[PDB]
């Protein structure tokens, strides 16, 4: 019943963990504790098998541990900066090659899976810093330029007309802009890792850069030159909706150094490079 | 069922492309590959006719390629500028003879059809540039003056009363103004091209200027003269809703030079005038 299912959503009890049943002492030639890790399988022994447990009714749920929950939280993926210093025409617009590889926080979560398919919710948080005192009337334009569409080279470029491209206009004072984007890949899922090239020569590119092109985001201060200079920083937040993930993998142990690559750097003292805290010895807890 | 049809709208699967069926080797005196282009008809040969194909279930849809989708995107059609320099009375109001011929981006899309019928959605994006520092309280008035109605000659002209004409008042800080306009022509469709004149003499006008008069848009800063000068730029965006188009035509190959006319200019080196990139020779890919 969708209504009973609805209540489960509200109470967050869609996925319940099993109970612990009462066990008793045993003397058998069947030893569940013994197994063989060589098989590649995990021994499914439970607490009732090693000790005498009591009956306990579990009331915990796994809803929050779902992939939708794990990846369904908005995190910053980019910080666009438009700092008017000495040339309005040149400093009033910018572009960014879209990707989820620049911020370690969210990148690491997505990278715990090999492939992922999801829709995106983008929320933008613009903040206008009054460098000279007043900010006037700030109106911004965020244009999504898919690969192929002409990228504007000036703040008054004809590409800004957005005859076909999607543009979001934000007027300072109004609530934060937000919009959704369907699964944009030409494949069935986004490659989180890609052991491939775009060719077979020594100079061929390697990794996700070959497969993950999401276009460019071109920003612009629509308002014309004002007496007082401002610094507009627009933070882009991304949330995954309707997510699916395949083939889980180990979490990134070292820091990220570049986008679209697993490359890393190690110091002379590697223990400083990983989260592992050195032990004094095996018996020191 | 409107509900099943509704789901199709949400999933964007209203128009599905056909599947590819499995074909087999053939030896026949019926050769589909051979035909005669002289007839003016395109040979309807499909992949199953030239090679041995496999069965593949198509999941692509043509919804996004519909005329409604193609022309149903808001693009800029005009940039109204009110720059208060030295005379408020004269610089605080302006007019524009409405047309969709001034911005190449949207003009070219509509011009891929000979006739088009649609309703219009107009969204305006005003941006007030604080030239002297503060902007005060900016209130704008956009009046639609149909052909015949008196056009205001001063910022305090009686025509601004809008006793009958439609006027939209925008107060700085409020969301972007937007309104719809029904199919405005005296004909059954808008002429995108018109091989005709408004007379039969040497001095008769030629082209769409003869048929496409949509009136004038008169803007004005309602607010009286303020200490600090401002530059108000209002960008008009137009979207076609409930569109129908007839007789498709070749896309504009060269740049547009003027409104209501197909006129163009060519340089001494014509290859620079068209998008065609010169080939080294026939065999160089």
């Amino acid at each position: 019943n969708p209504v009973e299912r609805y209540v489960d959503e509200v109470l967050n009890e869609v996925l319940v963990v099993p109970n612990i049943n009462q066990s008793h002492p045993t003397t058998s030639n069947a030893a569940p504790v013994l197994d063989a890790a060589e098989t590649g399988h995990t021994n499914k022994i439970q607490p009732e098998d090693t000790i005498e447990t009591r009956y306990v009714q579990s009331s915990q749920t796994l809803d929050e541990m779902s992939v939708e929950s794990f990846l369904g939280r908005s995190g910053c993926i980019h910080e666009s900066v438009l700092d008017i210093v000495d040339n309005y025409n040149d400093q009033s617009f910018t572009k960014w090659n879209i990707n989820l590889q620049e911020m370690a926080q969210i990148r690491r979560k997505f990278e715990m899976f090999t492939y992922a398919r999801f829709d995106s919710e983008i929320t933008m948080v613009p903040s206008v810093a009054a460098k000279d005192g007043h900010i006037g009337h700030i109106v911004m334009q965020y244009m999504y330029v898919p690969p192929g569409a002409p990228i504007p080279t000036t703040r008054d470029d004809y590409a800004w007309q957005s005859g076909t491209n999607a543009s979001v206009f934000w007027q300072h004072g109004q609530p934060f802009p937000r919009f959704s984007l369907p699964f944009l890949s030409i494949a069935s899922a986004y490659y989180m890792f890609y052991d491939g090239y775009d060719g077979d020569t020594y100079k061929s590119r390697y990794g996700t850069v070959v497969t993950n092109d999401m276009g460019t985001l071109c920003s612009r201060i629509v308002t014309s030159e004002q007496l007082h200079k401002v610094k507009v920083v627009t933070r882009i937040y991304h949330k995954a909706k309707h997510t699916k993930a395949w083939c889980p993998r180990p979490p990134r142990a070292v820091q990220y150094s570049h986008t679209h690559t697993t490359n890393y750097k190690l110091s002379s003292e590697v223990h400083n490079d990983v989260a592992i805290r050195p032990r004094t010895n095996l018996t020191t807890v | 069922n409107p509900v099943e049809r509704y789901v199709d709208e949400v999933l964007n699967e209203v128009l599905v492309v056909p599947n590819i069926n499995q074909s087999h080797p053939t030896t026949s005196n019926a050769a589909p590959v051979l035909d005669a282009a002289e007839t003016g008809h395109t040979n309807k040969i499909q992949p199953e006719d030239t090679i041995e194909t496999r069965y593949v279930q198509s999941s692509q849809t043509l919804d996004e390629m519909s005329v409604e989708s193609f022309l149903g995107r808001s693009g800029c059609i005009h940039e109204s500028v009110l720059d208060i320099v030295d005379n408020y009375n004269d610089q605080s109001f302006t007019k524009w003879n409405i047309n969709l011929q001034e911005m190449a981006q949207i003009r070219r899309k509509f011009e891929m059809f000979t006739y088009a019928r649609f309703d219009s959605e107009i969204t305006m994006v005003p941006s007030v540039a604080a030239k002297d520092g503060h902007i005060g309280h900016i209130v704008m008035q956009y009046m639609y003056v149909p052909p015949g109605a008196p056009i205001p000659t001063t910022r305090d002209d009686y025509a601004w009363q809008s006793g009958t004409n439609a006027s939209v008042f925008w107060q700085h800080g409020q969301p972007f103004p937007r309104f719809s306009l029904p199919f405005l022509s005296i004909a059954s469709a808008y002429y995108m091209f018109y091989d005709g004149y408004d007379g039969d003499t040497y001095k008769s006008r030629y082209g769409t200027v003869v048929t496409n008069d949509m009136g004038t848009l008169c803007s004005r800063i309602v607010t009286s003269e303020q200490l600090h000068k401002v530059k108000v730029v209002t960008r008009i965006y137009h979207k076609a809703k409930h569109t129908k188009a007839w007789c498709p035509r070749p896309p504009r190959a060269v740049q547009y030079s003027h409104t209501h006319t197909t006129n163009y200019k060519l340089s001494s080196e014509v290859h620079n005038d068209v998008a065609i990139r010169p080939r080294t020779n026939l065999t160089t890919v």
């Binding site: 969708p2 209504v3 996925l15 779902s66 959704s180 309707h242 | -």
Partner: peptide, 29 residues
């Protein structure tokens, strides 16, 4: 877009926009 259930505890699962991507978080399997 409204999925109306009844039990009365009537449930309305409305979808304000015509694109599937527009909807919120998904239900659990």
């Amino acid at each position: 877009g409204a999925q109306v259930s009844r039990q009365s505890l009537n449930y309305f699962n409305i979808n304000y926009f015509k694109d599937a991507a527009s909807s919120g978080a998904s239900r659990l399997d």
